[PDB]
């Protein structure tokens, strides 16, 4: 049944949106913090979701299920573990994985998230309780796995100590920055405190990457590449009502972070349109197909492989081409990007 079962390589999932309702509930349950429901099965189909929603309903997700394991090292280390797990099974042999690491924190971080009370966890700390996680799962599962440090839209006074802790912690295992959260509050670009977060992380080696353009208009787009100086684009789908940026950006063979499932889900992406995806097939584009958020979409990744090729005529071919372009374009050094490319194109041949 799976729609492409070869290896292959995922650059846009959030960690955050990637925890077993198991693991959620068990916390929940030891820490007495009080989930919508206490069952596995009964919690994944109340934080999960079949339609478009709005933003206010999609965000009061992630209050259900984070207070359970924020401010909790235990669950920190676990859901890191379990992570590099869950893309074993999805025959990923690389994978970058993002998240902020001051919405896990309870302490050292204003205002403190979800409602938490003060305890000792700090954004630092959580940084190498993920780390752990995530070696000790690679180890294991045998899955290459590097993290990505997100800022906050609204919340730029976080952004130098994102940097900060990508250059203290970094190929142990962060590679990158990225701009997470959402894309549509005026000006956000270019509040000082991201602008100056990401001009630090071209000075200091970083990669970047930055959601934009996913509902943003192409303008947050251009912003994020003229002006962060970005890598890749997450999603980046509003790229196309600007026909000489989409022709500039294929020029420089930019990597779009495509998320086909989560952006039917969203609202992102018209049922009755062409997805955007399609558009970048034919013109061949460079990017990559990804999950974003496996426990909010009630998906996996074939999840999004069975969409393309089923309702969008994608071949075993384009798939291949997709995750060669996604191996091309990750943050790892480039001696380690070669033998990933080598992996693939045995395994593809
Ligand atoms: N799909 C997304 O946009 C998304 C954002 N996150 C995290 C950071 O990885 C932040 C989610 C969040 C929700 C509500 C308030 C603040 C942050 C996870 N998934
Ligand atoms: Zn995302």
Redesign the pocket.
Known sequence: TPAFDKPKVELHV?L??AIKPETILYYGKRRGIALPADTPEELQNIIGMDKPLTLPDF?AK?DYYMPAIAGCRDAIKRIAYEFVEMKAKDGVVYVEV???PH?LANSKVEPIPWNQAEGDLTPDEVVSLVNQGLQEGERDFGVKVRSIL?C?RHQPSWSSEVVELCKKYREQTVVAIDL??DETIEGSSLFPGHVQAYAEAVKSGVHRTVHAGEVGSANVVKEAVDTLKTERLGHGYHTLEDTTLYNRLRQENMHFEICPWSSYLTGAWKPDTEHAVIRFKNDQVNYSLNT??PLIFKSTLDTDYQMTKKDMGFTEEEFKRLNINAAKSSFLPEDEKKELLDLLYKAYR
Do not use: I, K, Q, V
């Open positions: 959030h955050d949106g965000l992630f993002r998240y902020s919405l997100c906050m997470a959260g974003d958020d």
